Write a protein that binds this ligand. Structure first.
Ligand SMILES: CCCCCCCCCCCCCCCCCC(=O)OC[C@H](COP(=O)([O-])OCC(O)COP(=O)([O-])OC[C@@H](COC(=O)CCCCCCCCCCCCCCCCC)OC(=O)CCCCCCCCCCCCCCCCC)OC(=O)CCCCCCCCCCCCCCCCC
Ligand SMILES: CCCCCCCCCCCCCCCCCC(=O)OC[C@H](COP(=O)([O-])OCC(O)COP(=O)([O-])OC[C@@H](COC(=O)CCCCCCCCCCCCCCCCC)OC(=O)CCCCCCCCCCCCCCCCC)OC(=O)CCCCCCCCCCCCCCCCC
Ligand SMILES: CCCCCCCCCCCCCCCCCC(=O)OC[C@H](COP(=O)([O-])OCC(O)COP(=O)([O-])OC[C@@H](COC(=O)CCCCCCCCCCCCCCCCC)OC(=O)CCCCCCCCCCCCCCCCC)OC(=O)CCCCCCCCCCCCCCCCC
Ligand SMILES: CCCCCCCCCCCCCCCCC[C@@H](O)O[C@H](CO[C@H](O)CCCCCCCCCCCCCCC)COP(=O)(O)OCC[N+](C)(C)C
Ligand SMILES: CCCCCCCC/C=C\CCCCCCCC(=O)OC[C@H](COP(=O)(O)OCCN)OC(=O)CCCCCCC/C=C\CCCCCCCC
Ligand SMILES: CCCCCCCC/C=C\CCCCCCCC(=O)O[C@H](COC(=O)CCCCCCC/C=C/CCCCCCCC)COP(=O)(O)OCCN
Ligand SMILES: Nc1ncnc2c1ncn2[C@@H]1O[C@H](COP(=O)(O)OP(=O)(O)O)[C@@H](O)[C@H]1O
Lengths: 63, 140, 121, 98, 320, 42, 347, 83
């Protein structure tokens, strides 16, 4: 075939790989920040559910 | 614990040769005691006296190796006037291997220990310079 | 990543409802073909172990192996695609919600950037 | 942390050391295990009663039951060993080696 | 539905089928005795099933066609060569002895499987027990070495520590000159080369060791040449005695199930007959083993599983 | 041994394979229809 | 034993493991461990003999000590924070003691001594169950509290386990001891990535379970315990020896076989956390596992050892009992590298 | 029917203790689900005051809550007294 086919195929491939590399760097940074802080959906370790607490008079005023 | 490592690391590399030698001797003695305890637990030789002789010889060998390594490394660092150079640690490691060979009394162990201890000491110095991590914290 | 504690997660659901918002894998997917190939290999090995004509001992058994492998492969591919979509969605949402930690790089041109040149001699 | 808890943990550690020393008489090993269990029972009972954690009063009894079951199991094994050797010395179990 | 743990779980209990008539019996005698004739009569009268003595080609009879295979493919030994050259340099004596012992072990396993599956008893010739007398005769005469009998003892103990000894042992006693005359009358060209010392060693190895060992745990019926002709008295003696000293009364449904699982699946039965001890008489080089196995595979019904042979005539191959 | 082709097992295996294939085809069709519905393609 | 009793004991073992995995209370987890230990002992003693009894008593002693240590750790954690839920340990001493308890249960060095002897004494079937099924409860518990475990202790124990498994596997001749040391080394590999990513731990566990199930089923199929008994196999079922050699190559970490997937992936994860020296050390150590696997392959399939005459009779009989899932196990343990990304299923 | 009766007759001879034990156990298992007094036992257990009854704060929209113990509103234990 002609050179334009290989030229444009290489251009598309280069775009795909560059986007993938940038996405991988962003993923690593996001993971590091998320584990360090814990304010995102990832790395949310469970805590005690508050629906288990009994809110009723307890035979003693001071709980 | 980690107190002995802190004592060794607090001293500057190019000064206080005697204190460095004492810290290295303490570390070597601790390692010798641990390995002697393991050997005693896993292989009770014949009695109490042979056991105490074995633990004494192991601890003395390890302490001598550590003392020689520390003294030689610090002396080389001072004399060369070039601190933070892994070459000093390489010389210290080879000297320690040489004393290990002399204690075991065979040239093969002496040469192999010189090579494989100078290499390890140089790698440790390089890691200390570049901040290499052995037990890395869980970043990501 | 540890998406185990992700909020609003059903404890024992293979495929959540939102996973239906993604395109299902094609039936001619190369990975599905690979699962079919694995099933065929399992059939051939089963024939070999039992000391039977390897190629043509049990056609029904080989067909069942292939079909089971394709079934499990299809569902596994759906779950994998859903999980990767979740990861990308969380990534983009977090990078949008924290602009301070991901500043826009000041775009520069190679003309005004000095890179050291090391000749090869 | 008062001295009672410290003494109980010291007792548990002493019993563990006795179990791991292994002079002879596997029955002594079982006795050391059950001493560790008794120390666990005492410590758990004190902790649970001190804080008035009412629903946790079940925990010691349950514990004891299970542990006693294990003891029974252990005894059975010991018996078989003796029935194969005539005595329960620990050093006789040396057929298998690393 | 072949027998298995599931069948035992639902219905298959083997203690119901035993009806006091099983009474596995082994008829043992000296070479060229009347025991074979006697064994057949006992099985006929008692309603049991007679198993002919296991030979070189016994295993070939139970697998595939009953027609025996080539000597090279099954046994690699011959009895006539043993009679002609007992001190053969190529170790034929041990190879014959081991092949015969393993064949007898397979026959005993088959007999036990039949007894447990059906409940009808069996009658046997020389079993795995009493087979050691031929080994002792060979060793004392100098045919085989000491390492030979050591390996045989190891294999025998490992294989026989898992089977129930027979209920009744029947022994036919014939004096050495009488059996020598019988051998001369037989006319088999190789058999008159049997030395009298060999037969004497067989007989005294029978009497000194095997008989007391069977007596201490089982019932022994020592019969002379004349009194063994009348099978009626033999059967009456069999009925009259009661078995209460062996392990058979102590067996239960679970132990019988374990034994029935062991007797079938012949690979486990023969598993320890090929222990990796390298005696020059039994070991085979890699090239010889490869060539012989390749030649074995080219047999008509031996390339694939029993039901998957096209040349034999099995059809519907692609749907089995 | 002397075994004929067990038609029961063969029938069960063929039925299982055919049922699994039909179920997979139907599930794929429903999944693509649901995806096109959710994304507003068709 | 009776088949019904054996089935009941197996159900009880599985129920104990399930109770450990699905429970959110420390007491219930301890109860599950006790039930598992209680029902697991007769499985070792199914074939009664002195070796089985000694192995069972060693296993019982080790497991009972581990359970007592685990309960003491639970008690201390409750003392310093009145919480029963399995979460952050809230105490360093309790975490250390619980880590030792779970190491004893798993078999990580220096608590590894019991594994080779227990595997050697007990049968192949018992060994297969012990090697793969037992690991699931302690590994689940460790995964549930991975955010609190001290990286130094876990990492040094994993490194020691890899070293010990690699060194001890070289000397052994019996296949069961080789499998025990292989399990020790694989668990050293698998527990090293716990502080970083538990998904890699689960993936390595699944791959290791598949590989060891395939290898144990192959060893049961050709009833061989020592190396020479395995060398004799080629004369009867060469296909079994070939499949076993392929599985052994897979278990050594050779690409493109499936056994390369975990190690590689695990290394990748420890490279994300700037841990470089340790993955290199564990790779050069796994070279020893590869060496003794290669020696076994040389003995088994790649060369033809001398046979025995009686083996001729074994040519005429076929394997009466066929174990299902063996071909599937072999295929899953050999040719699943191209589907590596499926690990995102959080398996 | 006949076989079951014959088996029960056989067991009542030469083994009466087991028959009595099984009969008593079966009766103890079965009967409580049929007795009409079990709800009475539950109500009696519920009516025993172990803790102090904490009064509610009045907001003008509690007609079912009595303002005094003597007031007719509230649960009554006349059914227990009649028992
Ligand atoms: C940087 C810090 C400092 C350096 C640290 C690193 C140095 C490591 C030192 C120890 C290395 C161990 C292996 C070496 C050789 C093996 C031992 C041996 O027998 O050789 C005797 C050999 C003489 O030959 P031989 O005794 O006549 O031959 C005996 C028979 O032939 C046959 O011999 P045998 O049958 O009597 O063998 C003895 C026996 C016994 O073998 C052993 O003792 C094994 C040693 C393991 C412990 C290693 C000590 C590490 C301490 C860590 C903490 C340090 C705190 C500070 O072996 C066994 O039976 C099997 C044991 C292995 C099975 C599994 C056991 C593992 C247990 C756990 C391992 C460690 C756990 C740590 C914590 C775990 C918590 C999770 O040479 C010696 O005498 C050497 C003795 C000790 C020299 C150590 C040198 C120290 C240098 C320090 C320099 C510091 C410089 C200053 C700072 C910078
Ligand atoms: C890539 C892999 C792909 C396949 C994976 C596995 C599947 C098959 C393996 C089962 C074993 C069966 C076997 O043994 O072969 C016998 C059999 C022929 O002999 P037979 O008379 O039927 O039965 C003889 C008995 O089987 C047994 O005969 P024997 O016992 O009398 O002969 C003794 C021999 C028997 O021992 C063996 O034959 C060993 C069997 C191979 C091991 C299986 C390993 C499992 C998969 C791992 C592969 C690893 C790949 C990664 C790279 C690393 C390489 C290790 O043992 C020895 O010679 C002793 C020493 C062995 C030498 C060293 C062993 C190295 C093994 C490593 C193999 C790796 C490559 C395998 C490629 C396929 C080989 C069949 O072969 C076949 O017929 C099957 C071959 C494939 C059939 C293809 C037909 C479909 C194509 C037509 C449609 C076109 C498709 C495209 C559609 C679109 C077009 C429009
Ligand atoms: C990820 C998950 C990883 C899983 C970890 C690995 C699992 C391996 C443990 C499974 C049990 C081991 C076993 O069955 O033998 C090993 C077996 C080798 O077979 P074998 O050597 O011929 O069996 C010898 C037995 O000792 C001969 O045993 P037997 O003579 O006592 O026969 C009794 C038989 C027959 O069972 C019955 O009789 C049924 C009666 C039910 C009674 C109801 C009572 C309930 C109350 O029952 C069994 O054999 C045990 C079945 C337990 C049910 C499990 C569901 O290998 C496997 O089972 C591989 C399993 C495949 C992997 C697991 C699933 C794929 C993922
Ligand atoms: C060889 C590789 C391993 C193969 C393993 C055997 C394959 C057959 C298994 C059959 C299906 C497995 C599970 C059955 C489906 C129903 C169970 C389902 O509900 O479980 C879900 C989960 O599904 C399973 O986890 C996924 C199973 C898929 C395993 C294959 C991955 C292997 C990756 C590399 C090999 C590629 C595949 C090769 C061919 C199979 C629930 O997840 P969740 O309760 O919320 O999270 C629990 C885990 N946590 C606690 C860590 C968060
Ligand atoms: C990294 C740590 C570097 C450690 C340096 C020392 C290693 C030297 C080993 C090279 C070969 C040693 C040698 O020459 O062999 C001879 C010598 C004599 O043999 P013995 O039977 O023990 O006799 C003792 C009385 N003479 O052999 C040895 O003692 C050494 C054998 C084991 C050495 C292994 C050291 C490994 C240390 C790290 C373990 C983790
Ligand atoms: C569902 C309720 C269960 C709970 C109630 C019972 C709890 C406690 C009672 C049971 C304790 C364990 C019982 C163990 C049973 C073992 C059976 C056994 O093996 O014994 C047989 C003998 O027992 C039998 O005969 C079989 C069972 C006997 C009868 C079982 C129950 C019969 C029916 C019970 C209900 C009756 C009908 C109700 C009538 C209601 C009134 C009109 C063997 O006799 P040996 O003592 O060993 O020999 C010594 C002499 N050589
Ligand atoms: N272990 C053995 N070694 C050598 N020969 C054996 C062995 N077992 C059986 N035989 C041979 O089997 C033949 C038949 O045995 P025998 O009962 O004496 O003759 P018959 O069957 O006519 O009654 C004998 O010629 C005997 O040599």
């Amino acid at each position: 075939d002609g050179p334009e086919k290989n030229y444009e195929k290489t251009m598309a491939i280069l775009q795909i790989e560059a986007e993938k590399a940038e996405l991988r760097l962003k993923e690593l940074e996001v993971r590091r920040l998320m584990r360090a802080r814990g304010d995102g959906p990832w790395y949310q370790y469970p805590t005690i559910d508050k629906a288990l607490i009994d809110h009723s008079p307890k035979t003693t005023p001071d709980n | 614990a980690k107190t002995l490592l802190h004592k060794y690391s607090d001293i500057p590399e190019g000064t206080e040769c005697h204190r460095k030698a004492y810290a290295s001797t303490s570390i070597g003695g601790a390692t010798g005691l641990i390995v002697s305890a393991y050997s005693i637990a896993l292989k009770p030789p014949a009695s109490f006296l042979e056991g105490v002789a074995r633990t004494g010889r192991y601890t003395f060998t390890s302490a001598a190796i550590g003392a020689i390594f520390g003294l030689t490394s610090c002396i080389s660092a001072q004399v060369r006037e070039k601190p933070d150079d892994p070459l000093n640690y390489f010389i210290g490691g080879c000297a320690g291997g040489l004393t290990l060979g002399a204690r075991t009394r065979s040239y093969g162990i002496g040469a192999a220990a010189c090579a494989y201890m100078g290499l390890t000491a140089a790698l440790v110095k390089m890691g200390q310079l570049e901040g290499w991590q052995v037990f890395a914290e869980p970043k990501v | 990543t540890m998406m185990s504690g992700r909020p609003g997660r059903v404890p024992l659901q293979f495929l959540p409802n939102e996973a239906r918002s993604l395109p299902p894998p094609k039936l001619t997917d190369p990975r599905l073909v690979y699962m079919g190939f694995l099933g065929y290999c399992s059939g051939l090995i089963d024939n070999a172990i039992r000391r039977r004509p390897v190629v043509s001992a049990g056609l029904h058994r080989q067909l069942l192996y292939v079909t089971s492998f394709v079934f499990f492969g299809y569902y596994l591919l759906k779950r994998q695609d859903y999980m990767y979509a979740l990861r990308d969605h969380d990534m983009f949402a977090y990078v949008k919600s924290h602009p301070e930690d991901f500043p826009e790089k000041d775009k520069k041109t190679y003309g005004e950037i000095l890179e050291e040149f090391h000749p090869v001699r | 942390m008062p001295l009672v808890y410290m003494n109980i943990i010291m007792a548990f550690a002493i019993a563990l050391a006795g179990l791991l020393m292994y002079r002879s008489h596997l029955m002594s090993s079982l006795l050391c295990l059950e001493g560790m269990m008794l120390s666990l029972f005492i410590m758990s009972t004190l902790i649970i009663l001190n804080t008035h954690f009412t629903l946790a009063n079940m925990m010691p009894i349950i514990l004891l039951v299970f542990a006693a079951c294990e003891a029974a199991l252990g005894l059975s094994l010991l018996v078989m060993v003796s029935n194969t050797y005539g005595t329960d010395y620990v050093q006789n179990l040396n057929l298998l080696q690393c | 539905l072949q027998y298995g743990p599931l069948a035992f779980v639902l219905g298959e209990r083997t203690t119901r089928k035993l009806t006091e008539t099983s009474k596995v019996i082994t008829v043992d005698g000296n070479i060229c005795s009347g025991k074979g004739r006697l064994a057949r009569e006992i099985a006929e009268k008692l309603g049991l099933r007679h198993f002919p003595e296991a030979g070189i080609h016994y295993a070939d009879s139970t697998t595939g066609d009953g027609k025996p295979l080539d000597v090279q493919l099954s046994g690699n030994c011959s009895l006539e060569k043993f009679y002609d050259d007992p001190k053969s340099n190529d170790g034929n004596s041990y190879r014959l002895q081991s092949w015969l012992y393993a064949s007898r072990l397979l026959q005993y396993a088959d007999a036990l499987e039949h007894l447990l599956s059906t409940g009808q008893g069996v009658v046997l010739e020389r079993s795995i027990y009493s087979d050691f007398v031929f080994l002792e005769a060979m060793y004392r005469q100098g045919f085989i070495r000491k390492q030979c009998v050591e390996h045989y003892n190891e294999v025998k103990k490992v294989t026989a520590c898992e089977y129930l000894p027979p209920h009744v042992v029947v022994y036919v006693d014939v004096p050495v000159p009488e059996i020598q005359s019988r051998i001369q009358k037989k006319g088999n060209p190789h058999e008159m080369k049997i030395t009298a010392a060999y037969l004497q060693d067989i007989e005294n190895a029978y009497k000194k060791t095997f008989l007391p060992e069977m007596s201490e745990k089982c019932e022994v019926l020592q019969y002379s040449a004349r009194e063994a002709e009348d099978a009626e008295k033999v059967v009456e003696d069999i009925e009259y005695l009661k078995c209460d000293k062996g392990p058979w009364p102590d067996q239960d449904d679970r132990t019988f199930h374990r034994l029935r699982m062991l007797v079938q699946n012949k690979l486990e039965v023969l598993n320890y007959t090929t222990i990796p001890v390298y005696l020059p008489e039994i070991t085979i080089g890699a090239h010889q083993s490869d060539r012989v196995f390749q030649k074995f595979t080219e047999l008509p019904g031996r390339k694939y599983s029993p039901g998957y042979n096209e040349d034999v005539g099995d059809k519907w191959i692609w749907l089995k | 041994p002397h075994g004929s082709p067990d038609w029961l097992k063969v029938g069960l295996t063929l039925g299982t394979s055919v049922f699994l294939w039909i179920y997979l085809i139907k599930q794929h069709k429903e999944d693509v229809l649901e995806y096109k519905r959710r994304n507003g393609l068709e | 034993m009776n088949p019904i009793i054996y089935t009941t004991l197996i159900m009880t073992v599985m129920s104990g493991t399930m109770l450990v995995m699905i429970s959110s209370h420390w007491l219930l987890i301890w109860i599950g461990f006790e039930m598992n230990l209680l029902a697991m002992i007769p499985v070792l003693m199914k074939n009664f003999n002195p070796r089985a009894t000694e192995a069972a008593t060693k296993y019982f002693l080790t497991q009972a000590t581990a359970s007592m240590m685990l309960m003491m750790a639970i008690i201390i954690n409750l003392l310093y924070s009145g919480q029963w839920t399995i979460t952050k340990m809230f105490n360093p001493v309790a975490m250390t003691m619980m880590t030792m308890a779970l190491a004893m249960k798993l078999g990580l060095s220096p608590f590894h001594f019991w594994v080779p002897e227990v595997t050697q004494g007990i049968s192949l079937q018992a060994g297969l169950l012990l090697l793969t099924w037992q690991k699931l409860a302690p590994l689940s518990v460790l995964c549930q509290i991975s955010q609190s475990i001290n990286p130094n202790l876990m990492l040094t124990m994993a490194m020691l386990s890899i070293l010990i498994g690699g060194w001890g596997g070289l000397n052994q001749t019996q296949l069961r001891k080789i499998m025990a040391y292989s399990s020790i080394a694989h668990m050293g590999w698998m527990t090293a990535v716990l502080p970083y990513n538990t998904t890699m731990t689960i993936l390595n566990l699944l791959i290791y379970i598949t590989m060891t199930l395939a290898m144990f089923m192959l060893l049961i199929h050709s009833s061989a315990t020592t190396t020479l008994s395995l060398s004799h196999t080629w004369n009867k079922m060469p296909v079994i020896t070939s499949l076993m050699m392929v599985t052994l190559l897979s278990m050594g970490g050779l690409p493109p076989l499936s056994g390369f997937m975990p190690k590689w992936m695990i290394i990748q994860e420890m490279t994300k956390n700037e841990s470089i020296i340790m993955p290199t050390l564990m790779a050069m150590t796994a070279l020893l596992n590869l060496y003794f696997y290669m020696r076994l392959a040389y003995s088994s399939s790649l060369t033809m050892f001398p046979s025995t005459n009686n083996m001729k009779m074994k040519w005429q009989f076929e394997h009466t009992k066929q174990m299902k899932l063996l071909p599937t196990m072999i295929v899953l343990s050999t040719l699943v590298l191209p589907m590596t990304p499926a690990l995102s299923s959080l398996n | 029917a006949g076989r079951i009766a014959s088996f029960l007759k056989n067991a009542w001879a030469k083994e009466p203790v087991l028959v009595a034990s099984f009969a008593i156990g079966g009766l103890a298992i079965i009967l409580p689900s049929l007795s009409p007094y079990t709800n009475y036992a539950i109500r009696i257990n519920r009516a025993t005051p172990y803790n102090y009854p904490v009064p509610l704060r009045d907001d003008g929209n509690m007609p079912d809550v009595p303002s005094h113990p003597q007031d007719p509103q509230g649960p009554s234990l006349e059914w227990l007294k009649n028992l």
